[PDB]
Design a protein around this nucleic acid. Structure first.
Lengths: 328, 222, 582, 174
DNA sequence: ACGCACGAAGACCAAGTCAATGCTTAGTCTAA
């Protein structure tokens, strides 16, 4: 079962790329030693081959959101929006092993390695939630195969396809946002400001003297609060395509996926919680080539069976199933 | 019964296999997928992964392998080291612990190890055209590869989508099926190039360490 | 499949699956090479559609529409369903204005034809009116055949101005691309004139669909024609001429100075002044009504304004029209009709007909691709001479001198009739002067009036006369005209188009605003492959009959020799053809 | 919980864009070396995707106020007008480190790198002020998702939605 | 009353890198 979700991000999407990369004030990535350098946290870029500038094949980087991040976002959305309220309604309680399995598929609950009988595999892989995301001490094969969030760009034509050519962006989609942290003590201006500080003026004087001495020592050869740097993000408004496939899905699993897609807009993508990065709105959801996204979320006469099945599953779901899956 | 060349084209980068990626293993996985869709998930996978349209080579000692060479890796771009992590949201777990959803008495998470361990791992991603040589039925191999969508590994996160495939009959002189894990006492005349002795499994599954045997692994393919 | 008797071997593997996909509701894309028997296989598909009950509609340019009519008339299983015609106004003559024009010129042939009733005289029109049993009058084809002395566009059915008028509303439907354009206009405007086309048809076939997108752009784009409009007003309009031309010329000068030298805010005062004044605007009222429609189309707010002075004439010009044809217009066609289409330039070398799917909006799941085909007698019997051009194909006189010398030695070496492919009137006029010194009368060139109406027939007659004529095609000759020696039924004569030369790639021949939208969305890649399409289309003139044996080709562009990266697809395309072993 | 604040600025807003920019007397940004150039501190613009009537989506600059700057503005406003008066009413004193962390999220540039206890995390995330911003020597995820200040412009219609089209401004606002 | 919490501890060598994408020029008339 193929799920095609068209995602447009209202706010920039920031997936931090590993590594210590530098940038200058003018915007030159990795400036030479001559000019000043400031730390930069670039976006997650994947090397892809594309026909750039009428070339036969060019390995150009493409800013994407990692597929594992999308998988974890879907899992967290399910847990925090349908699974956890359903278990709370029954006053269910989970041990550490079951909870770790449910939230990250971590086998710490029973790292011995437990055999699974064929009947047990049949029963558990049919679970509405744990079947999609395999793991735990048993560590099955999940039925969910979610792709990365490839932007609809010129370089992603051979990964996305030509079905959504109308929304492609020709130029670059990355922008550098500069951050700064200021020492609050240096911004005091009157004894009224320093009234709340227990040391009053003396504490601020000692703080400023220590800062000056540390700065002088560092210039001659403990880190203060003051810091200036930038992080690279993907510009807002770019459309993204998310491809989700479920292998041999039951009605309950598809219903759960649809519920998560309904509640997915409330969550964020990748990082940037402080700056409200990653906010997005679902534009279209496609089920096996059939559009299902109504303005009131995923609905229609062709998905009532999935919603009914998942509602029935939520009605009878208990923590004992999670414990059995986690071998706790 | 016929000499074949299998070509696989990628629409997404795949995980570069650490060890040999064998055509027979992929065909067995696809056959197991077929019998799963036809019977369900209660089947024993070891009862259907040898029903492949490939004829077998048997050595003096009875050790046998499929005549299906390991996939050749030709890279259209430099390998990219892909980074992935794993973490349980500590604030979310703390909230659940407060509300009784989680039964944890421990005071603190331990990012170094335990239930709340943060882990960092890497695997390489490559753009490649998968070419391998085998002896079998063209129609059945093409039918099996028709249902294959992803190649290599890390398929849960969508690595190695198949843009297309092609199966062609080629002269024997091009390249043999021997570029695989052959048994220890295989005949020298049928081996293409140098073969280093190492430990690997001869039949799929190839990750089962209990099935590992001393085998001749091609040096120019590992 | 009925009607498969005349289907050739090359079309056999594709015809059955194309027909099967019709009832599947899937739109399919095919490349029936010119000279492979397109007309009769289109007729066979139409007969198949008519046999199963649903009405049939076919879209084609007028000349190939006549050709297809000739092919489909012999098919009984196509004749079982009622066959209807096209109802285009310029497809006929005024005829009262035409009658008076012929009387004043004493052309008794035209006068006799119109007073008889304007009944068919040409073979194509006679067949389409007798075998199809459709009473017709005043058709412009017969008037053009009778006399070529009617270059003005005033020869056109007056809106106030017949048995053909009755048959407008009185199975198989014959129409062009622009009939479909008019009907999709009808649906988009009223659903959201000549309404004979059913509002929902289960089968449509287009023999030239690569040019359907530009036709839909043309109908959805209205040209101000401002400088020719004011010139015609000064020459003809006399009703309060002085203030009207004052206002119109003030508008022209202000837009030229501000914008050239309703999306643009500065165009708003000009639009208001045009709305207030041009309403002041006789039988020539349509010449002002077209400009009025362009003005209100610009006012509609759904249009994009493109304006610039003419590079050659420096006449101010304004272009307005909808660039957003990709959302509701073609999708309306897809919803209305399940159809198929054919064009020789559908599938590109690496695009895999994506450009077709984008230009002609097709649902992603409804589109089905088809393998490409090509007969052996289309690529083998021609060799390309390595005589490349040494100068950039600009308008510099020295480049014209060198190109003229090169093509002059080619013409001296030419075996028979030859075609030199010129992109624009600017290059031809710069080039014809040097040629006329040596070639003399042997060279014949298009003009603003001179076109395929009589020039192709004159070239055919002169070639049969042994003059070894040279046809300097300009734009029109790039597509549609036939250069197959049909009378010489060997068929391998290879003399009427023994040799042909290309002057440019070309680059950016298409100037539709939709093309601008596409190049903005996708970049310079789209225009390069569109030019590849054009180059392949130009090669379509080389062969239109099977069994051609020996022809020659010349390439004249320093860019192909300059090894610039972007001409790689042209190198790949020409690499299919063996070079001349010089 | 979503909060949308509609702001009309009485006086011009000037957020410095880092990096050196030059302008001539005429107003041409980055003038040719022949003409006279003068230093210019541009207003910060973040590249955004804007759709036009043609249907093409293009990347255009948009003068905005950074999310970090006015997040700090909100934090300072809360501290100065609500938190600190409440503390001073009861004569409550904060240490220099506590004040620095309250106003900037950290007492120093080096984070502790030691995980926090669950009960401490719950208590801090239940704090009216510390729960919103978090931070501290041990990184605590705050509850406040705060966005930048997007002007209601034709370029920002895709970002801020179409429900504020009545207040949009067509021309340049710089 | 076995299960879980929680600090101390024990391996301990240690570099060179940090761009990956630029590209041109006017014919159509075959619906109101």
């Amino acid at each position: 079962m193929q799920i095609e979700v068209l995602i447009r991000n209202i706010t920039p999407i920031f997936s931090a790329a590993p590594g210590s990369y530098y940038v200058s004030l003018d915007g030159t990535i990795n400036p030479p030693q001559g000019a000043s350098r400031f730390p930069l946290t670039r976006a997650r870029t994947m090397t892809v081959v594309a026909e750039t500038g009428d070339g036969v094949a060019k390995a150009v980087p493409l800013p994407i959101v990692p597929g594992n991040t999308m998988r974890n976002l879907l899992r967290r959305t399910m847990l925090k929006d349908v699974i956890e309220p359903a278990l709370r309604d029954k006053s269910a309680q989970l041990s550490i092993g079951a909870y770790a399995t449910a939230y990250a598929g971590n086998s710490s609950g029973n790292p011995d390695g437990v055999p699974s009988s064929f009947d047990e595999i049949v029963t558990m892989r049919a679970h509405p939630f744990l079947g999609l995301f395999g793991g735990g001490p048993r560590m099955l094969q999940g039925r969910l195969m979610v792709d990365s969030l490839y932007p609809i760009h010129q370089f992603s034509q051979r990964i996305i396809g030509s079905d959504y050519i109308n929304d492609s962006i020709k130029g670059g989609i990355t922008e550098i946002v500069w951050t700064r942290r200021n020492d609050p003590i240096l911004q005091l201006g009157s004894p009224d400001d320093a009234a709340v500080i227990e040391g009053g003026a003396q504490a601020a004087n000692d703080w400023i003297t220590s800062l000056l001495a540390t700065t002088k020592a560092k210039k001659g050869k403990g880190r203060g609060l003051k810091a200036f740097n930038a992080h690279e993000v993907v510009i807002a408004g770019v459309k993204w395509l998310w491809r989700i496939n479920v292998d041999r899905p039951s009605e309950s699993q598809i219903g759960l996926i649809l519920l998560a897609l309904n509640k997915l807009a409330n969550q964020r993508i990748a990082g940037g919680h402080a700056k409200d990065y990653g906010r997005f709105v679902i534009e279209d959801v496609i089920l096996d080539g059939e559009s299902v996204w109504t303005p009131s979320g995923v609905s229609g006469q062709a998905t009532e069976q999935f919603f009914d099945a998942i509602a029935e599953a939520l009605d009878g779901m208990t923590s004992s199933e999670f414990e059995q899956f986690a071998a706790s | 019964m016929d000499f074949l060349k299998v070509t696989i084209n990628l629409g997404s980068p795949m995980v570069e296999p650490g060890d040999l990626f064998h055509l027979d293993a992929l065909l067995g996985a696809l056959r197991v997928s077929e019998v799963r869709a036809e019977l369900g998930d209660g089947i024993n996978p070891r009862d259907h992964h040898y029903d492949l349209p490939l004829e077998q080579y048997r050595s003096r000692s009875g050790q046998w392998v499929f005549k299906a060479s390991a996939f050749h890796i030709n890279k259209g771009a430099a390998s990219q080291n892909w980074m992935q992590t794993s973490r349980i949201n500590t604030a979310e777990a703390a909230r659940h612990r407060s509300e009784g959803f989680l039964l944890l008495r421990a005071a603190k998470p331990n990012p170094a190890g335990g239930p709340f361990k943060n882990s960092l791992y890497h695997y390489p991603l490559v753009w490649a055209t998968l070419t391998a040589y085998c002896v079998g039925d063209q129609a059945r191999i093409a039918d099996l590869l028709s249902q294959c969508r992803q190649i290599g590994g890390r398929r849960g996160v969508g690595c190695g989508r198949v843009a297309g495939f092609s199966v062609e009959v080629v002269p024997e002189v091009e390249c043999t099926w021997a570029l695989r894990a052959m048994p220890d006492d295989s005949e020298q005349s049928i081996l293409c190039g140098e073969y280093a002795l190492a430990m690997s499994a001869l039949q799929s599954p190839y990750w089962d360490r209990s099935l590992h045997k001393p085998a001749l692994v091609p040096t120019s393919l590992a | 499949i009925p009607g498969q008797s005349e289907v050739r071997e090359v079309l056999l593997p594709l015809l059955e699956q194309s027909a099967s996909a019709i009832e599947k509701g899937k739109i399919v894309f095919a490349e029936a090479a010119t000279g492979t028997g397109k007309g009769r296989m289109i007729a066979s598909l139409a007969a198949n559609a008519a046999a199963k009950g649903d009405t049939v509609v076919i879209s084609a340019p007028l000349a190939v529409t006549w050709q297809l009519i000739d092919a489909l008339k012999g098919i009984r299983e196509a004749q079982v369903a009622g066959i209807t015609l096209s109802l285009g106004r310029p497809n006929f003559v005024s005829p009262d204005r035409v009658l008076e024009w012929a009387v004043d010129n004493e052309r008794v042939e035209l006068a006799a034809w119109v007073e008889q009733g304007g009944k068919p005289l040409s073979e194509r029109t006679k067949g389409a009116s007798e075998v199809i049993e459709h009473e017709l009058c005043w058709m412009l084809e017969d008037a053009l055949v009778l006399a070529e002395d009617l270059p003005i566009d005033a020869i056109m059915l007056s809106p106030d101005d017949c048995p053909a008028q009755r048959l407008y509303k009185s199975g198989i439907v014959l129409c062009s691309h622009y009939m479909l354009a008019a009907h999709v206009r009808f649906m988009q405007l009223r659903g959201l004139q000549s309404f004979s086309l059913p509002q929902a048809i289960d089968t449509l076939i287009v023999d030239e669909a690569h040019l359907l997108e530009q036709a839909f752009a043309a109908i959805y784009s209205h040209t101000l024609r401002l400088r020719p409009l004011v010139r015609a007003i000064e020459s003809h309009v006399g009703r309060g001429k002085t203030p009207v031309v004052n206002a119109l010329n003030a508008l022209a000068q202000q837009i030229t100075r501000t914008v050239q030298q309703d999306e643009v805010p500065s165009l708003e005062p000009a639009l208001r002044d045009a709305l207030t004044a041009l309403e002041s605007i006789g039988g020539a009222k349509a010449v002002i009504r077209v400009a009025i429609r362009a003005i209100k189309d610009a006012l509609s707010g759904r249009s994009r304004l493109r304006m610039e002075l003419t590079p050659v004439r420096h006449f101010p010009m304004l272009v307005s029209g909808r660039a957003n044809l990709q959302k509701a217009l073609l999708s309306l066609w897809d919803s209305v009709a399940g159809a198929a289409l054919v064009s020789a330039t559908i599938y590109a070398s690496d695009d895999h007909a994506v450009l077709t799917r984008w230009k002609l909006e097709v649902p992603p799941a409804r589109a089905i691709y088809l393998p490409p085909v090509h007969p052996a007698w289309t690529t083998e019997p021609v060799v390309l001479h390595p005589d490349r051009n040494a100068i950039e194909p600009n308008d510099s006189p020295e480049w014209a001198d060198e190109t003229a010398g090169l093509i002059t030695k080619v013409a001296e070496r030419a075996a028979g009739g030859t075609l030199v492919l010129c992109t624009s009137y600017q290059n031809a006029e710069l080039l014809q002067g040097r040629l006329l010194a040596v070639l003399g009368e042997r060279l014949i060139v298009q003009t603003k009036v001179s076109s395929a109406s009589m020039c192709v027939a004159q070239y055919k007659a002169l070639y049969r006369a042994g003059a070894r004529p040279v046809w300097l095609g300009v734009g029109a000759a790039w597509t549609g005209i036939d250069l197959s020696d049909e009378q010489a039924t060997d068929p391998a004569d290879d003399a009427m188009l023994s040799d042909l030369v290309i002057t440019r790639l070309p680059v950016g021949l298409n100037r539709s605003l939709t093309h601008e939208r596409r190049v903005a969305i996708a970049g310079f890649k789209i225009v390069t492959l569109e030019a590849v399409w054009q180059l392949r289309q130009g090669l379509g003139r080389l062969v239109r009959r099977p069994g051609v044996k020996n022809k020659n080709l010349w390439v004249l562009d320093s860019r192909i020799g300059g090894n610039t990266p972007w001409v790689a697809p042209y190198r790949k395309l020409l690499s299919r053809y063996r070079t001349a072993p010089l």
